[PDB]
Design a protein around this ligand. Sequence first.
Ligand SMILES: CCCCCCCCCC(=O)N(CCO)C[C@@H](O)[C@@H](O)[C@@H](O)[C@@H](O)CO
Ligand SMILES: CCCCCCCCCC(=O)N(CCO)C[C@@H](O)[C@@H](O)[C@@H](O)[C@@H](O)CO
Ligand SMILES: CCCCCCCCCC(=O)N(CCO)C[C@@H](O)[C@@H](O)[C@@H](O)[C@@H](O)CO
Ligand SMILES: CCCCCCCCCC(=O)N(CCO)C[C@@H](O)[C@@H](O)[C@@H](O)[C@@H](O)CO
Ligand SMILES: CC(C)(C)NC[C@H](O)COc1cccc2c1CC(C#N)=N2
Ligand code: NA
Lengths: 290, 120, 107
Amino acid sequence: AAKVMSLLMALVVLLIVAGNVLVIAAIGSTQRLQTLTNLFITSLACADLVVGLLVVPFGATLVVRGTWLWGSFLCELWTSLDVLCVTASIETLCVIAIDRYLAITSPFRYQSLMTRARAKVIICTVWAISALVSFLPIMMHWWRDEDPQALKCYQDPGCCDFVTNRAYAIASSIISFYIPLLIMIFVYLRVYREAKEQIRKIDRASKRKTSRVMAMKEHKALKTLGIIMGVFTLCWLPFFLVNIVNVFNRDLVPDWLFVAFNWLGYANSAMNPIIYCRSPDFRKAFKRLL
Amino acid sequence: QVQLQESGGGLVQAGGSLRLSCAASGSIFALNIMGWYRQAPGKQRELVAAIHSGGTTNYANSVKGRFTISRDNAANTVYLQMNSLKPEDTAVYYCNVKDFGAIIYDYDYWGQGTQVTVSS
Amino acid sequence: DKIIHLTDDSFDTDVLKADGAILVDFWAEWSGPSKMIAPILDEIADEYQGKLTVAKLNIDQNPGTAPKYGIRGIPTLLLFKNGEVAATKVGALSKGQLKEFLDANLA
Ligand SMILES: CCCCCCCCCC(=O)N(CCO)C[C@@H](O)[C@@H](O)[C@@H](O)[C@@H](O)CO
Ligand SMILES: CCCCCCCCCC(=O)N(CCO)C[C@@H](O)[C@@H](O)[C@@H](O)[C@@H](O)CO
Ligand SMILES: CCCCCCCCCC(=O)N(CCO)C[C@@H](O)[C@@H](O)[C@@H](O)[C@@H](O)CO
Ligand SMILES: CCCCCCCCCC(=O)N(CCO)C[C@@H](O)[C@@H](O)[C@@H](O)[C@@H](O)CO
Ligand SMILES: CC(C)(C)NC[C@H](O)COc1cccc2c1CC(C#N)=N2
Ligand code: NA
């Protein structure tokens, strides 16, 4: 187990850095890939890349050694960088859902509505929000619990557990995960509803001569739309569900499972290159890069 | 395969009329844009007109008020009703489908092209 | 057969001084859950030859050993690795559940 667990963490960091480096390289190097949507994909890839370089590796050690080897300052700063990048990943995922919703349902309105400069502001907003959810509260100790047993971890530099007060845990989890999850569900459900209402209008248009059935394109779209909500939810719902659970009754869910679910969330950062960069221009770029 | 069959073009007198028609045979996702682009002699391909599945429409300035892009509500077929033609409208007109079935990106289809020539 | 049948005196030699993994079983004749894993430990003694040695200590005949490791309920399977307690599991379980416990803790 502990030999296999250590090996498993290694390729997770490899997959994350490889994928996201490949994406950023492809977008930066290809004139054809520098679209509006891929600008938001670039934000996402940056976030997930920093996860693979700094965040996950230090998280790997803390599990393998069983303790924090780099002192209370870097514990805080690593924790702040972790929360920031995860917040920015999840919120950028949410922006992309919106961008594709508008690009598919209202394509002509969207072109005038969304400029490159407007997208840049949106990206900067997301990182600013991510910063203010992460660094500002964490470095200023607004997260801290009053509890003496929690305060023993804050005093010990070898302890780098993220034990938060009730208020932070709820607010930060809502802002970074639950609100984005709802927006993604709402947004992508209108994409489903728009497509299904449009298939209805074709059946009426025929004057009762044909009834449409799901073709190749519809089955794939619904699979794709599934993968997006599926992998995102699978990866972060467990960790963020448990994150609220421990606010009420801390003993119910064990520490090993809480950390196991956080590794599942780190796995998302490896999946995002696979989900969001399958376009034929991406595929061409990836082969040209390799 | 998805294939785009263009028709309705040819020679015509200035101040005249034509009605292009592109019938898209094959599997297309319900959400899409059917459009007409044109490539004038020794010039870059430009948008003429385009119509979403929803029904919103976008025309290029030159052809505003004259041309009308409509689509068959039943089939995957799009019509560009070209009125009040001028010799500058002379070009190879290409049918186009932007297919949104991947969600994150869009896949394109282009017709072979059909010649429209407007004499003075 | 392949199981060491422990005592209070021989516990230091059979478990604390013993080379490699020792799976100690604290049990009693009156415990229904203890005899439920008794036939499963016979199969585990065969299937993990070399990897571990199964040992059994009856806590009625040998009352002195059980208090030292904080045995509250039974059966308790304490996995000793070179005279040191590595893993712990209390209560009855099936063959597959014990294999998952042993394969995880032995590697
Ligand atoms: C929980 C996080 C959910 C995602 C957060 C993204 C929302 C960012 C909102 C945003 O940036 N705008 C409002 C879009 O609704 C843009 C507009 O304010 C726009 O007017 C400006 O960018 C400039 O045009 C001003 O000159
Ligand atoms: C769209 C932007 C909406 C963001 C603001 C609304 C949601 C978050 C606001 C909020 O602070 N909470 C409501 C969320 O459920 C939780 C906390 O108020 C609460 O946990 C603690 O303050 C108390 O427990 C104090 O004892
Ligand atoms: C450019 C857009 C500017 C908007 C940035 C505002 C971000 C939302 C405000 C905020 O920071 N929180 C909700 C405010 O409560 C989350 C936590 O910072 C806060 O809840 C915790 O620090 C406390 O619960 C600690 O006891
Ligand atoms: C051709 C066949 C096409 C397959 C269509 C599959 C869609 C399945 C994926 C999916 O829809 N979910 C992922 C669940 O793992 C459920 C989510 O839509 C949503 O319900 C959750 O994200 C949260 O609401 C949970 O709180
Ligand atoms: C090991 C650590 C703790 C570094 N991992 C954090 C995790 O990767 C990402 O977790 C979070 C992301 C965003 C907002 C959050 C959050 C945990 C909480 C809380 N309360 N609020
Ligand atoms: Na500490």
